[PDB]
Amino acid sequence: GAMGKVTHSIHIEKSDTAADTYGFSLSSVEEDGIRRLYVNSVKETGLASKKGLKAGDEILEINNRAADALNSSMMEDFFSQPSVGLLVRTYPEL
């Protein structure tokens, strides 16, 4: 069961998808005064789902950069590219 968090990394490519979309969203939030990035809106049978992303997973890094060191200019540049790497932190689904 869910006790400690688990951290894992994935590398995803648009050429492995049907329609050049990974099938998830990233939520930029302020949570108790702290800026965080979360996985959200994971499409069933989409690439992100295949790679084991879950809504609510915290994104710790994108392309080897800490989430709290990103800005919107970097975000847009990163997700304009044909591929992207993520470090995420999750709980077991159950």
């Binding site: 998830f24 990233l26 939520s27 930029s28 975000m75």
Partner: peptide
């Protein structure tokens, strides 16, 4: 408090 959603 969500201030942006990126759909990728």
């Amino acid at each position: 408090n969500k201030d942006k959603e990126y759909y990728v």
